Amino acid sequence: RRQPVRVLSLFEDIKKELTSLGFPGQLKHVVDVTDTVRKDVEEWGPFDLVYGATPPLGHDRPPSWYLFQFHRLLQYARPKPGSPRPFFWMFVDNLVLNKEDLDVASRFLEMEPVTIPDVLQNAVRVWSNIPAIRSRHWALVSEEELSLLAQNKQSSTKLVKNCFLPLREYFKYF
Amino acid sequence: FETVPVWRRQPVRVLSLFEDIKKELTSLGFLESGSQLKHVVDVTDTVRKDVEEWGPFDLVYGATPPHTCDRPPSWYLFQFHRLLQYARPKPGSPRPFFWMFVDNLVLNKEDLDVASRFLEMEPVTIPDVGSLQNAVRVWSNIPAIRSRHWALVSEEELSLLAQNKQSSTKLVKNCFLPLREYFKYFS
Amino acid sequence: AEKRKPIRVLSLFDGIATGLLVLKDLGIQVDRYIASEVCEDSITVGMVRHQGKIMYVGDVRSVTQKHIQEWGPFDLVIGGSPCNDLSIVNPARKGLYEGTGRLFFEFYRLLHDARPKEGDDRPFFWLFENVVAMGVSDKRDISRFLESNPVMIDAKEVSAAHRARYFWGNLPGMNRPLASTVNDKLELQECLEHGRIAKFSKVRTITTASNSIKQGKDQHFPVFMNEKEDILWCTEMERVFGFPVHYTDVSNMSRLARQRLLGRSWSVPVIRHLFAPLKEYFACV
Amino acid sequence: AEKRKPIRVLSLFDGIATGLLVLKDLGIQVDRYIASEVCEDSITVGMVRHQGKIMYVGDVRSVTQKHIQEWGPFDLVIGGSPCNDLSIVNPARKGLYEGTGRLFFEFYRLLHDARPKEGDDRPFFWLFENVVAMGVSDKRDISRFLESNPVMIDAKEVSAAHRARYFWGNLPGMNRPLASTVNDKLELQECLEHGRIAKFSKVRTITTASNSIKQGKDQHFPVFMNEKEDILWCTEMERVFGFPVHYTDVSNMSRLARQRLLGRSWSVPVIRHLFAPLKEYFACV
DNA sequence: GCATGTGTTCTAATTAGAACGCATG
DNA sequence: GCATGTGTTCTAATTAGAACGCATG
Ligand SMILES: Nc1ncnc2c1ncn2[C@@H]1O[C@H](CSCC[C@H](N)C(=O)O)[C@@H](O)[C@H]1O
Ligand SMILES: Nc1ncnc2c1ncn2[C@@H]1O[C@H](CSCC[C@H](N)C(=O)O)[C@@H](O)[C@H]1O
């Protein structure tokens, strides 16, 4: 009995993860958000989920650009201070941001990142206001291994989609 | 500055500094055979009252030592100038007032410039005498010295004289000559 | 009618406290002046020249959202970020997203943290400054994050030096034509010490590069003094920038140290032109 | 004697024109102030800080008898010859008759040339300054050539620093005790900028050495700032010597260049005391 | 007795000057 | 239009610091 969700998608396409997870057009996606003023995001209807993510490791723009452009459009899609309903946002990094860029990310998004691992193979950093993204006592993984994981990947998603999981109770329905 | 008749002339009173010229001025006849000439060597403590007490002077002599100097070369000039200004007579004074500073080539170019600056005149080179034997530089208010056509000596030829002399007369004693027509002559 | 209250200012990248200096010249009462600065030379000037009125808070990246709320509400939010990675005078510029150009986004974050929320129609003024000699994309990107276009003001028309700068903000009448005052020194001759002859009317933009004090590509001397040619003195650079004489003469700083502070600073008469309408909103002496 | 007339001054080894500064401060009207100086920095200060009133003549050894006669008559002859070959702080000092020590005799010569003739009643004053830390034989000869005994005046009694100096002269009441005036800053604390704390009551004799500003055999820093030791700033040294603030802030001079000038100059209040009874003898505008 | 000093000359660290650079209004 | 620049880097001259120095009140 809870209504479905308008999703704003940034940089990377989640039209596969949100459709295969069963989450007609309710989703808006933009790739180059350079000339996206406030009125544009406002005209694209309300939003209950604002998603943005850095490109996969080895894709073409300064890693902080994604973090800054995310913060810009995120402040555009916020509702009234008197919350009409549930609002959620999430920024996903794929080991692209270096040590400094992680400090910038945490400071601008005003919270510490949760480390999302896979058994050690593929790694993902997540900033999100979801009380269930943080609730999951996420499997601990050492940073040094994460650094080596990126180093072995130069030479050349699942439970992250389960990060979408706890969003079902707020939404609908399929 | 003008010449006065013979009978009105007086025996010269001489303040001889650093070096006594009691033998030179006597042989020329400026002092009698009987003892007029004050010879001071340690003028380091000599004040103005001393010179005034030591009696009026007509000829204040100055000279740098030929040898070893216990004091710097410039010390002799500065002290000479100091005492000279002490012994100068009142502006209405009558007798001839003379002063003289003699250098035996012991003052460098910088010190020579200082000498001419303090005494307000360039020196006179007095040679004697066929190669050059001896020479001295003289500063004085005596007209005949800065007027006579002495022999021209090259500077590059005077530094040679200071070389062989440091490796160790009559006409030189003619700086007192033109003072005969101003004071009493004894013979 | 409720009386006007003294202004409350958050100054990011404060420098040599030009903002406070200008506000005090306009006779505007300032209750608190919280400034973020890192350079020891800059902070020292601020402490001495303003008797320690300024609450120095340190690095701009250490300033949190809660701190802005706790120290607020702020009536005025000014800032001028480093352009050493933005200006096209540097062939080794690292752009807006790398180096020190990234520090601009710190002004962006804190500006959003300082603004009143909804239902708050209280007066809130802000101003951002940078050079016009930057990249096209960077100029655009700055306008996009601040959601506004800059007003261009050259200090050439209000001082004795060229200095075309960009100004983002909502200060009352930023676009209005610039007017000359009685105490505006437009000519170089007016900025020189006694006995020194000016060769030109205006001088080019003064940077941290010491030879920017020489005019033209031929590096001409600006001033003639006493049978020789000379560059501007520190006291003369201050007068050119519209600063009080001997303003930067603190902490045994040399010519280069003083020109470094002046080089990166604002033109006082320009800032005065921009801050002048704020007198209508806050208490005055 | 119809009335008082503006004073005519001959300043040898003038430096940063401490003499004219004091004569101005006493309101004494100055007809002429002829300075003999060779240092470029020094002359520049005097030209700027005194609006080209000073008639500079160059090297003192170039000043002839004819020059003094033509430029004069002089009412006052002041001077302070170099002591870098006279002070015992220099292990390689050359003495009074060598190096720069012989420059004293240039003052002796020009004093002799500037004096009025015999029977001249007109007032004539002279003052000569040099350090106390000199040879016992050099002090003797200076007295002999000047025909007077000096008066030892330490600036500590009237300023915030030790400065034992000999003063030869004939000024009215040179022997009278020094009385601290309301304007004099007697402690280091009063000379510091805001936010600065003095570790010492009075600082030691400031020479041209970079670390003459440090105190004791342990070389202690004179002041405290933000719980961290520091040395005196240039503006502070000027307060200690009694000069106006930023008096030496000319010609882009560094700390060294500024301290080199201040180190060799006179303590302003000491000269203010000595020149004080001259306002009775001359026109005061 | 014993600290002090109108200085000079060593360093490593800056200063002051010049070269470099090319996109933007 | 093209020429102007909130800069950085490198080089010799200066700086800021410190050692050295011993006769003198
Ligand atoms: N991380 C940082 N946090 C705070 N200030 C910084 C900073 N990085 C650089 N700055 C300062 O930002 C200033 C940019 S120049 C701006 C100076 C100012 N407009 C004035 O009138 O003086 C510089 O003074 C620099 O010291
Ligand atoms: N040959 C010369 N002719 C004139 N001045 C000279 C000189 N040689 C050195 N000097 C100057 O003599 C001064 C010695 S210290 C003089 C300081 C001065 N009494 C004051 O209060 O400022 C120095 O400024 C030096 O530049």
Side-chain angles (χ1 to χ4, degrees), chain D residues 176-184 186-196 198-216 218 220:
Chain D
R176 68 188 174 95
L178 261 62
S180 59
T181 203
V182 192
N183 306 23
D184 295 324
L186 301 182
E187 292 179 351
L188 174 65
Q189 180 54 56
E190 308 175 44
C191 301
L192 307 183
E193 302 290 341
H194 194 82
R196 306 262 283 179
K199 291 184 56 184
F200 302 91
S201 178
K202 298 178 183 296
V203 295
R204 71 180 193 165
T205 300
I206 302 177
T207 71
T208 53
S210 175
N211 277 18
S212 60
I213 210 68
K214 299 192 178 187
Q215 312 300 308
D218 320 84
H220 290 154

Side-chain angles (χ1 to χ4, degrees), chain A residues 14 18-20 22-25:
Chain A
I14 52 178
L18 271 56
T19 215
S20 51
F23 259 113

Side-chain angles (χ1 to χ4, degrees), chain B residues 86-89 91-92 94 96-108 111-127 130:
Chain B
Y86 293 171
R88 281 198 198 263
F97 190 64
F98 293 112
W99 53 266
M100 176 189 301
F101 191 74
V102 179
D103 182 37
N104 195 68
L105 306 202
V106 310
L107 299 180
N108 49 88
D111 285 28
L112 282 179
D113 190 41
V114 170
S116 303
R117 190 190 310 112
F118 272 80
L119 301 178
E120 307 182 19
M121 62 165 56
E122 298 295 324
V124 172
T125 60
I126 304 181

Side-chain angles (χ1 to χ4, degrees), chain C residues 13-18 36-39 42 58-61 80-82 103 129 243 261 264-266:
Chain C
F13 313 96
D14 175 69
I16 46 182
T18 309
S36 179
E37 180 53 70
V38 172
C39 183
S42 298
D59 196 315
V60 64
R61 293 166 296 189
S81 62
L103 295 175
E129 176 270 333
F243 279 90
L261 296 176
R264 312 177 306 195
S265 180
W266 292 335

Side-chain angles (χ1 to χ4, degrees), chain B residues 117, chain D residues 12-13 36 58-63 103 106-107 109-110:
Chain B
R117 190 190 310 112
Chain D
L12 307 185
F13 314 99
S36 188
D59 199 287
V60 67
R61 297 172 294 191
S62 69
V63 185
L103 295 182
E106 302 297 318
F107 176 87
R109 192 190 85 253
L110 289 184

